Each structure stands twice: as C-alpha cells, then as structure tokens.
Swiss-Prot record:
Location within or outside the cell: Cytoplasm; Nucleus; Nucleus, Cajal body
Residues of the full protein shown: 80 to 155 of 170
Tissue-by-tissue expression: Isoform 1 is highly expressed in adult and fetal heart, skeletal muscle, and at a much lower levels in adipose tissue and in aorta. Undetectable in other tissues. Isoform 2 and isoform 3 are poorly detected in heart.
Name assigned to this protein: Heat shock protein beta-7
Domain sHSP: 1-76
Family from the record: Belongs to the small heat shock protein (HSP20) family.
Complexes and interactors: Interacts with C-terminal domain of actin-binding protein 280.
Annotated organism of origin: Homo sapiens
Length: 76
C-alpha cells in the first residue's frame, strides 16, 4: 500500500532540492546560493515516516504545481 505526501518548494528549482533519509526520518531541503556561494534562501521540511514504511523505498518527484512529492511503500 502506497504512502505519499507533498512539500511546497515552489520558490526553488529542482537542482536546489535535497532529500535525506536517516532511518525513518525524512528531510526535504532547498537552498539558493548567491554569487559568493553563501545561502540566499533556505527551506527545510523534517518529518517522520510511519513505522510500517520502508525508508529505502522513498522516491521523490517535482509536481507540475511546483511542489515535491515523496512516495514510498509500506511493508505488507
């Protein structure tokens, strides 16, 4: 059975986005860098996947509305 949630990263481009998992912790992060390479705009969304979801199965996609979707499978 599928698990999915959406994160609003509409102010950022795909190349700006990072998805991290640590066990069942998931972080969607986005940054824009200035010319000097410092951070001009930063965003992070930290949440926890349900116990019955497999963290290794997480995939992400940028949806047409500009948000990012996290999809993952549950263990049966």
């Amino acid at each position: 059975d599928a698990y999915e949630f959406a994160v609003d990263v509409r102010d950022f481009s795909p190349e700006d986005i990072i998805v991290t998992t640590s066990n069942n912790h998931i972080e969607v992060r986005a940054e824009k860098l200035a010319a000097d390479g410092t951070v001009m705009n930063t965003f992070a969304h930290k949440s926890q996947l349900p116990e019955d979801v497999d963290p290794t199965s997480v995939t992400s996609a940028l949806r047409e509305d500009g948000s990012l979707t996290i999809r993952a499978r549950r263990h049966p």
